[PDB]
Each structure stands twice: as structure tokens, then as C-alpha cells.
Amino acid sequence: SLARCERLRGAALRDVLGRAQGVLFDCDGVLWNGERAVPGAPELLERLARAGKAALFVSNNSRRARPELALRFARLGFGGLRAEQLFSSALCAARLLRQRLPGPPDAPGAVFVLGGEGLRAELRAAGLRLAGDPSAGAPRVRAVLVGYDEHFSFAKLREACAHLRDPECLLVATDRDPWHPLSDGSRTPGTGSLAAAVETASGRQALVVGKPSPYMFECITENFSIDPARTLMVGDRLETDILFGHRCGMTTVLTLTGVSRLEEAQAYLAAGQHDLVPHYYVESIADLTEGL
Amino acid sequence: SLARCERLRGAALRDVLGRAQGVLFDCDGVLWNGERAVPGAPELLERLARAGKAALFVSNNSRRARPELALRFARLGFGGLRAEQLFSSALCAARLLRQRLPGPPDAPGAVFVLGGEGLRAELRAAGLRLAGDPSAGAPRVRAVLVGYDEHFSFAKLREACAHLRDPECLLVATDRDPWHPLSDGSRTPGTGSLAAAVETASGRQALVVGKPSPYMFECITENFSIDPARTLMVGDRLETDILFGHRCGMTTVLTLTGVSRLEEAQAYLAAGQHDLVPHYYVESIADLTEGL
Ligand code: NA
Ligand code: NA
């Protein structure tokens, strides 16, 4: 494998960025951490545009529908982004459920959602009928969707299992991220931990929407012409972003501003686990800018 | 391996029961299902006693402290049992935490419990200090215990992770049973599904108290002289009871009144997974009685 976790700098940086037609970024851990933008990040995005290179964003975060996700970007200092550049697991879960939900067109099945109002909004926008929405003048639940659910409960887990007793009922998860570090130094459980409970209790394996599934790259290509061979994938999490990159055939860049540490990358290398090793790393994405 | 999933009947039955000094039973799925005793079960227990063979009971169910567990037995038609014959994951979790909790004798650490009042009662009876109990005139949490928690929540999961940020804080689970079938034909999530969430979110592997750990057999032997070579283990769940039996060196009998199906036993056999194959099976434990 060519992925040898090289520090991207100098001539190599200019040639890599030179060749690249476009760059896909995760957001948390890459552009910002909590409320603080990574210094130089907004400038890198400006420079990319002015070099005529495309930028798209690919987040496993299922908490916000696209419009509030756009706000999130703008709030943290990232200007004239178009909402169409932003892809989340919530958006891509809605797409998938539209594509896959079984049953007739003619009364549709409902989705039982474990997740918050932003995820629910994204689903309704795709035309999906949700369990627990107002009933007509109770639809069959045809999918269970496990999202980031800060109100997860035993009762909700039990109801999910009830729906999943029907083998035709889909089980979908927005992502399998196990936990996330917060700016106050603590951690919050991630969707992967909730998916673990639901899969264990139901005996069913979830379809996973988010990275490291290739699915989000399918959603992106639906909308944009991107040649994976000429696209950089830039992320902070090896098991999610870097694995995604390799599965899609992109050149992968680990940034060290987020979850994964350089020594974890180098440990995967030594163990010959090349799918979890980035092609390149940078301390922060501010290091990329001078290559343009 | 000798475990060839033979139907225990006739001469073989008389010689197996003849040799046996004692029999360990699970309760749910074996002695009863929901509110209904297995016909002939109370009689088998009577006959065992009158043949001078010991009977002990070994349940992963962490919902009841021993006294209410004894009630449960009596309610379902099982008479003069002594409470000392009954071993549960709740009882054995309390034991383990007494043995393993780190810190000084002199102010002790507290256990953060995910579980109900019966589990909490069992812990307090062993002299353990629980997080969220009245404070003196907040102790350091030194263990997280994952039990059967019908009030499990995201918030509780998040608090558990906070305690587990300390590598010295133990993570213990009462059992890893993924789900359970109810008498109304539905399923309830099991402790294993909650443990899956806690292990995923914390990145830590739980110490498991219940079957198929050998630990409960250690607790039993603490109190009773039992030769595993001369003890039958009788259970309905291959991955829990039958695996436990093999790990302890007992002769294993699958009863078909519970979770596991005969064809699952025979499938493990064919795949050479001998640790999950019983030595013998019976349709119900009523079939054992005539061997005495
Ligand atoms: Na990230
Ligand atoms: Na059982």
C-alpha cells in the first residue's frame, strides 16, 4: 500500500494540492473544535475557491437538519458556503430511507426514529412518514432509524425491538461513532453506542449510513461530479474518515486537531492495517494553505 | 469432544442421574415460563431430594434480591427451598464488588449502579456504598455496575462514561444476556444490550459476573461442596447455560422449554463448536424424573 502516513509539506504539498480537483472535509475536529474555529481554516477555504478547487463537507453528525447545519458553519466563521455543499448523516439517512423503505407507494410505511428534532425535520423534508406523528381522520412501522438520541431510553429500545420482530422492517443507523470528546474535556456517548444496544437486543445488524460506509460518497456523487482519484479526504478520525477515504478511492489526509493521534496512525501502519493509515497528515489544516 | 447432544432417556438416564451428586438448574425457561410452572418440575425437585441429590439454582436475573427471588420460587409452586440454594447475578455481583472494589477500607468507594431496587438492595446487603445514596453530614465512584435497568437512559449512559474516564474505576456487568422472550410472545432487551452501549461509549470491556462466566460457580463452591465432575448443569440457553457448564467441567443438559432450539444445538455440533453443544437434552425437565 501507498498509505505511509507522510507529513504533507513543501514540494509534495504543492503537487498533491496541485493535482487535486477538490477536497472533502469533516467539520468537527477539522474546521473547528466546539465553539473555536481552527486558526487559518476559513482562510484555507477561501484559497481553495480562488484556486478553483471544489470543497464539500461530510459530517456524521445527525443533530441538525441542513439549514441549521449551514448556520453552524457560518456561526463558527465559515462564510459564503452554500447549503448544497454540506452533507450529514441525517440528510443521507433520509435519502436512503426514501430509496429502501419497503411497502406500497400508496399508503407508505412509517419510520420509528431514535433521534432529535433536527433529524426528524430532515426525514420529513424527504417525504418520510414518522411513527408518532399525527394519524389520519397507526401506520405500519417499516424501518427503525437509530440516530443521535439524547433522550434514548430502555422503553424506546424495547419499542424498537418490537418493530424489528418483523424481518421486513429495516434497521438503519445514521453512524457508528462510539463517543465524542467535548470542549470541556468530557465525552458524550455516540450513535454507535445506541446502535450497539439496538443491534444486541434485536439480534439484527444495522445498515450504517455514515462514514466509514461509502454511502455518503454516493449521495455526494448524485449531486456533484467528483473524481475520487483526484479528491482529497481530510478528517481527524482514522476509523471513520480515513477508512471512508480508502473505501472511496480518495487520497487521505489526517489532521491532528481532532480525535485520532499520530501514534495511532503509525501503530496501524506497523500492524499492516493499511485501510486505517492516512496517506498524509498535517498538524492542522492551516498547514495545507501554503500549497495553493 | 463427548458432547454430542444425545437425548437422555432409559438406561443412560438412570446411569447419568445415578452417578450425579447434584444438579444445578437455571430457573426461567427451565422450571417455569412466566407465571406457569413446567408440569412435573416441582415433582422432579422432590424426587431429587428423596434420592439424596443436591439441587441448586443459578439465574442471570438481576431484578430481585434473594428474599424476593425465594418468593418468586414459592409463588410458582416450588416449596421448601432454602434461600441459600438460590444464586443470582445480583447476589454474585455484590460479592464480586466486595472482593474487587479498589480504594481504602476507610473511606470506601461508591458503586454507580444501572439497575433497579432489588439489585440496589442486594448491593447494600453486601455492605457496598452506592452513588446517589444520602451523603454524610459525594464519594468517589470506584465502580460502574450495569444491571437490568428498565430506566436506562442516555443521561445515565453519559454519567457512566464520566466515571469510567478513570481507568481505575471498574466496569462490571451482571450478565450479557442480549434479550429475553416474554410469555406474551414479545421480547425485552437484556442487560447485554445495555452493557454493549456502556462498553461502546466508554471504550472499556466489562467484567461479566453471570453465566457463561465461571464466577457464579466460584460463588457456589464458596458455600457448598460440589464436585463439578459429578454435577449436572440444566439450562435452556446454549450461549449462557451450556457454555457455563462446559467451562466449569459439568455434564450439560439442554431443556427445550426455553430460549434455545434443538436445531441450534445440532448446528453448533456440525460446526464443531463443542463448547456450545450440550451433552444431553430433554424436551422438559419432567423427563428427568423417571431416572431417579
Ligand atoms: Na470529525
Ligand atoms: Na433460562
From Swiss-Prot, chains A, B:
Expression sites (tissue/organ): Ubiquitously expressed (at protein level). Highly expressed in all the regions of central nerve system except the spinal cord. Also expressed at high level in liver and testis. In fetus, it is weakly expressed in all organs except brain.
Keyword match Repeat: no
Source species, domain of life: Eukaryota
InterPro entries per UniProt: HAD-like_sf, HAD-SF_hydro_IIA, HAD_sf, PGP_euk
Subcellular locations according to the entry: Cytoplasm, Cytosol; Cytoplasm, Cytoskeleton; Cell projection, Ruffle membrane; Cell projection, Lamellipodium membrane
Biological processes, Gene Ontology terms: actin rod assembly; cellular response to ATP; dephosphorylation; positive regulation of actin filament depolymerization; protein dephosphorylation; pyridoxal phosphate catabolic process; regulation of cytokinesis; regulation of mitotic nuclear division
Binding site for Mg(2+): D26, D28, D236
Activity regulation (UniProt): Inhibited by NaF, Zn(2+), Ca(2+), Mn(2+) and EDTA.
GO molecular function: heat shock protein binding; magnesium ion binding; phosphoprotein phosphatase activity; protein homodimerization activity; protein serine/threonine phosphatase activity; pyridoxal phosphatase activity
Pfam families cross-referenced by the UniProt entry: Hydrolase_6, Hydrolase_like
A GO cellular component entry from the record: lamellipodium membrane
Keywords: Cell membrane, Cell projection, Cytoplasm, Cytoskeleton, Hydrolase, Magnesium, Membrane, Metal-binding, Pyridoxal phosphate
Details of cofactor binding: Divalent metal ions. Mg(2+) is the most effective.
Active site: D26, D28
UniProt EC number: 3.1.3.16, 3.1.3.74
Cofactor(s) needed by this chain: Mg(2+)
Keyword Protein transport in record: no
Record text on subunit structure and interactions: Homodimer.
Functional summary from the UniProt entry: Functions as a pyridoxal phosphate (PLP) phosphatase, which also catalyzes the dephosphorylation of pyridoxine 5'-phosphate (PNP) and pyridoxamine 5'-phosphate (PMP), with order of substrate preference PLP > PNP > PMP and therefore plays a role in vitamin B6 metabolism. Also functions as a protein serine phosphatase that specifically dephosphorylates 'Ser-3' in proteins of the actin-depolymerizing factor (ADF)/cofilin family like CFL1 and DSTN. Thereby, regulates cofilin-dependent actin cytoskeleton reorganization, being required for normal progress through mitosis and normal cytokinesis.
Protein name: Chronophin
Protein source organism: Homo sapiens
Chain's gene name: PDXP
